Ligand binder design. Structure first.
Ligand SMILES: Nc1ncnc2c1ncn2[C@@H]1O[C@H](COP(=O)(O)OP(=O)(O)O)[C@@H](O)[C@H]1O
Ligand SMILES: [Mg+2]
Lengths: 79, 177, 456, 109
């Protein structure tokens, strides 16, 4: 069992809470994008990226979302 | 690849350093703290973030554990983080204890019976198992009403069944086959 | 208890359950907020199971709750299914209300044992010349119709449905596995207007449907046929296309984590086929006569799916695009088509020798094709010239206008008895018709009509 | 900022950049102290990009510094290119001196 002093140190940690409707890009390759954190995304849902670009959710895995870009992907970047 | 396949190099390296420097009990405590702390709902989230560097993840885990990690153990956590293996900490602690138990000629034996057995019976089972296995035996006795009578012994992968439920199952298979 | 969706990839879904409440293989599960049904395919470990959705996955998300039903997909069976249309899950899809079911059966079962098998050899007349001559069918046996795209599988099946129902008095079961929705509507209204509908059970899972539906519809229809067979009845089981059951399995195989085999097929191709095909059999209790259409990918009979299907059938009817191109319908190939009933001890020596005589003439004509193409017919021997003339007449006499094909041309349909079929081909082989013109044999039913057509 | 070569396998080079300075797909990169230009093909994640070298990789090593140019391979355009021989990067392969260019355009649009 973890100690009360260690539990206090854990409550002080800089851990950023993320909304269930938002995510962060992990990788970009040949029109396919990998995203981290879109917790409430549905299979076949439209994903909105900056600069007016849209994606479609195809792979919903345990740790990440795989999406196909509905236009030009060369303007998309990690983070 | 199993988690045990990936954790083997790390558990073995930690065990051999701890053994050679006479720190077996220190690493047993350190790996146990890391295994528990990395499983916490807030720390588990922090370790999975894509924006943090391996060194930032390692330092955050070291600052939280603090007092429980000596210089070698802090160096080990920074090594596990650089190779991107922080998810294996619970398996590394489990495999380290198996290497330690086998080195210290110790065996943890689970025991189950239909209804409670006396200390006289536990000590009779303990001497019999220690004489057969040639190891120190730690009987984790317990009860299970699913057994009609008798007892079952589980010494790791070795099982010795003297229960009435096992005999009834042998009869059912003998008549059905 | 209940689980939680952990992963979604197309038609395949992974669900995590408590370690003491993990559902069994083939067990049906239901998603709480949409009531979508899932079938468990495998147990992955750590309380996680992998399943195929029996519907669309659009709009599903990770973290939704899932309920285990404690049993496999169960469908209604018995008299209440006659004259009704059902989906893969046994729900009515004909707007006629709920099914008045007395009991439900799980769609997964083992095949009847080796000791339960039936040794039937009773001949079944189809009224179609080429089939009755070289591919004789038997009551309680299995028939397969092999062919490429747009060659005659559905037209030749609709004509067989029309002709076998003349002598048969029992029930029929029709399973639509991955084909056109319009053809299911046309067949339903045709039987409803003809008053034939009250003796047929209809199940559908057409091309519009997701992979899970197309993969299990065959099992749902067969489960209804097995109820009637086990009641001691003689029933007919018709399958719109058995290849679609295998194809639905190929679409899902890589998602199930399996390594692919030759030409991208699932490694389980022959086992998936045997588990279904062995249930479609007659037993000591009752009989199942079954007819199935088999699509041939890109006209290749050596493709793994068609190649693996031949061993499961008593009669094999092979359709050809080269024969269909000449105008001959049905486009059957006498040299590739065969039946277990084509034996002197089953059909008698007169039929057997007529069929063997026709095959010998057609085989010898096929050997001369390249010589005739370069140098023409005039260079052949006096013996080969006579054989080629008879081969051309036999090839045309095998054609027959159908009662379901009347809409395509205008010509009235013809039913030809086995006696008339043998008499016509025996006469052409003996040379009794050497004087009549080659076009007199094309599209005429019985041999006497070739004599009347030659008068024009 | 600047990146470091992390892996070299034939003509394929992986370069690691700080998380706030990862170069875009198709961007042209220059190796410090060597006349080698790299075109970015894919973003692998963890600040790492996969690129293809526009010349020989012989003599390169892990840890060399790489500089981003801010744009795709940009070549000279206009009247000055007439009667001249150039490579893929727009360099004058003929021994006739520099091209009298007034403007440069990126090759991707
Ligand atoms: N017996 C026939 N007589 C005339 N035309 C036919 C006959 N059988 C098939 N055809 C022609 O071939 C087409 C395709 O037949 P169909 O049975 O739908 O093919 P398949 O089911 O093998 O794809 C028909 O619409 C028709 O034009
Ligand atoms: Mg058709």
């Amino acid at each position: 069992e973890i100690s009360e002093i260690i539990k206090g140190r854990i409550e002080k940690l800089d851990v950023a809470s993320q909304a269930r409707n938002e995510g962060t890009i992990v990788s970009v390759s040949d029109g396919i994008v990998r995203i981290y954190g879109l917790a409430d995304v549905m299979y076949g849902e439209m994903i909105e990226f900056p600069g007016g670009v849209y994606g479609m959710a195809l792979n919903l895995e345990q740790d990440s979302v795989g999406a196909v870009v509905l236009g030009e992907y060369q303007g998309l970047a990690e983070g | 690849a199993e988690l045990t396949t990936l954790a083997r190099p790390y558990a073995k390296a930690a065990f051999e350093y701890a053994q050679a420097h006479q720190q077996l009990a220190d690493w047993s405590a350190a790996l146990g703290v890391l295994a528990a702390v990395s499983q916490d709902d807030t720390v588990r989230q922090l370790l999975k973030e894509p924006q943090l560097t391996s060194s930032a993840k390692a330092q955050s885990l070291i600052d939280v554990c603090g007092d429980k990690l000596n210089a070698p153990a802090q160096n080990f956590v920074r090594t596990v983080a650089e190779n991107k293996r922080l998810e294996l900490l619970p398996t590394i602690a489990e495999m380290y204890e198996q290497l330690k138990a086998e080195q210290e000629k110790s065996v943890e034996v689970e025991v189950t019976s239909a209804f409670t057995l006396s200390k006289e019976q536990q000590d009779k089972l303990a001497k019999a198992l220690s004489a057969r296995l040639s190891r120190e035996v730690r009987l984790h006795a317990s009860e299970d009403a699913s057994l009609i009578g008798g007892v079952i012994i589980r010494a790791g992968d070795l099982v010795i069944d003297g229960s009435v439920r096992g005999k009834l199952a042998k009869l059912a298979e003998a008549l059905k086959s | 208890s209940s689980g939680r969706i952990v992963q979604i990839i197309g038609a395949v879904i992974d669900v995590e359950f408590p370690r003491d409440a993990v559902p069994s293989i083939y067990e049906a599960l239901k998603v709480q907020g949409v009531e979508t049904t899932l079938e468990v395919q495998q147990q992955l470990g750590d309380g996680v199971v992998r399943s195929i959705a029996m519907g669309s996955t659009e709009g599903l998300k990770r973290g939704l709750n899932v309920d285990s039903t404690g049993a496999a997909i169960s469908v209604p069976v018995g008299k209440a299914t006659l004259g009704r249309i059902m989906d893969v899950l046994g729900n009515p899809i004909d707007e006629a209300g709920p099914i008045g079911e007395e009991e439900r059966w799980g769609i997964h079962r083992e095949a009847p044992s080796y000791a339960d098998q039936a040794g039937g050899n009773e001949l079944l007349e189809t009224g179609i010349k080429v089939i009755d001559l070289v591919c004789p069918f038997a009551k309680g046996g299995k028939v397969g119709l092999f062919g490429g795209a747009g060659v005659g599988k559905t037209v030749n099946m609709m004509e067989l449905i029309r002709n076998i129902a003349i002598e048969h008095s029992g029930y029929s079961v029709f399973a639509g596995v991955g084909e056109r929705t319009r053809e299911g509507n046309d067949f339903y209204h045709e039987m409803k207007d003809s008053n034939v509908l009250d003796k047929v059970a209809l199940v559908y899972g057409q091309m519009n449907e997701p992979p899970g539906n197309r993969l299990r519809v065959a099992l749902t229809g067969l489960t209804m046929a097995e109820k009637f067979r086990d009641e001691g009845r003689d029933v007919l089981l018709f399958i719109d296309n058995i290849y679609r059951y295998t194809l639905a399995g190929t679409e899902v195989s890589a998602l199930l984590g399996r390594m692919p085999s030759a030409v991208g097929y699932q490694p389980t191709l022959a086992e998936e086929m045997g588990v279904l095909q062995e249930r479609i059999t007659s037993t000591k209790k009752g009989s199942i006569t079954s007819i199935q259409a088999v699509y041939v990918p890109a006209d290749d009979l050596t493709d793994p799916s068609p190649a693996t299907t031949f061993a499961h059938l008593d009669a094999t009817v092979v359709l050809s695009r080269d024969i269909a191109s000449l105008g001959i319908y049905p486009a059957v190939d006498p040299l590739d088509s065969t039946s277990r009933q084509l034996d002197p001890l089953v059909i008698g020596q007169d039929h057997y020798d007529t069929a063997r005589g026709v095959q010998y003439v057609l085989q010898r004509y096929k050997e001369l094709k390249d010589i005739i193409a370069i140098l023409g017919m005039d260079e052949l021997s006096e013996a080969d010239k006579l054989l080629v003339a008879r081969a051309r007449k036999i090839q045309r006499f095998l054609s027959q206008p159908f009662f379901v094909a009347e809409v395509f041309t205008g010509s009235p349909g013809k039913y030809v008895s086995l006696k008339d079929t043998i008499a016509g081909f025996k006469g052409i082989l003996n040379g009794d018709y050497d004087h009549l013109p080659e076009q007199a044999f094309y599209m005429v039913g019985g041999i006497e009509e070739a004599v009347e057509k030659a008068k024009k």
